[PDB]
């Protein structure tokens, strides 16, 4: 090395020409999967190819405020919507047995979403114009004239898409309604100082509760 330069650390000391790859076929495969999903959606028969997903908070403390699509609703969410999972997988509803609803807000943010999805169901007959009431909480089925008049409108995909969340960053309050005496920094320091003994207290509380 020489002159004033950053000391090299280039991890290139093995046979790397074998590992080098270049993505010449990026837009080509983007097109191929575009036509793949278009063919799937055209062939399935008008049913949307997307599946409904829960709107759920992101983990950790970095992404506490953000929310995103999750892997399937919970059993209690489906029960509150009135659907057994084992029959709700049929209507494009994702379900997982691993998530647990840890808050009433999480429960109630997915229940009405499931109800909104259920409000748009249009069942189809199976036995050559022999429409039936349905099973397992799936909504009712429609007849010849009904299917002939609904099968040709604009499909709704916004509900399938991630729920846009509008949070009012710009908001304000009355000047006289402020708690002028609060000490946020002192509160933070006191909480950090007192963290150990509260853990002690919770430990002893639960030891008592074990009895």
């Amino acid at each position: 090395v020489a002159h004033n330069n950053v000391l090299p650390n280039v991890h290139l000391h093995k046979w790397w020409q074998r590992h080098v790859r270049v993505n010449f076929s990026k837009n080509i495969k983007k097109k191929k999967r575009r036509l793949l999903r278009e063919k799937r959606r055209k062939a399935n028969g008008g049913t949307p190819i997307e599946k409904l997903h829960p709107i759920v908070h992101c983990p950790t403390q970095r992404y506490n405020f953000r929310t995103r699509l999750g892997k399937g609703f919970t059993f209690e969410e489906l029960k509150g919507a009135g659907l057994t999972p084992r029959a709700a997988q049929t209507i494009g509803i994702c379900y997982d047995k691993r998530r647990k609803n840890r808050s009433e807000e999480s429960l109630t943010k997915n229940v009405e979403r499931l109800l909104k999805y259920k409000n748009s169901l249009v069942m189809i007959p199976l036995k050559k114009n022999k429409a039936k009431k349905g099973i397992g909480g799936i909504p009712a089925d429609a007849d010849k004239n009904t299917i002939k008049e609904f099968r040709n409108k604009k499909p709704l995909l916004s509900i399938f898409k991630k729920e846009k969340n509008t949070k009012p960053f710009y908001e304000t309050i009355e000047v006289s309604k402020i708690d002028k005496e609060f000490l946020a920094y002192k509160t933070l320091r006191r909480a950090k100082l007192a963290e150990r003994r509260k853990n002690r207290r919770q430990q002893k509380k639960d030891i008592k509760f074990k009895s």
Binding site: S103, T187, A191, K198, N199, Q202
Partner: protein, 95 residues
Amino acid sequence: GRKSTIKPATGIAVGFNSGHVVTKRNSKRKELIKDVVREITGFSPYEKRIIELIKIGTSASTKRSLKYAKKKLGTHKRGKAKREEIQKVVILQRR
């Protein structure tokens, strides 16, 4: 830190139950198996040694038995569990 299933969290970011303020929510066959299997098998040699070593019955004996079980099984939890189990069966059989 530590949370609490009751007493919902405070809006403070650092400390005890910190975070948002969201709301929270919440063998007869086996005994027969054990009895017949105990009758058929009995005790392994280290079980017998631990049983007699507890039987001789001193504080140094209890310490030696704990050491022996820990050495023969690995770890401390397994040795403690086996020592307690064998003294329980000693008390039960001394009938």
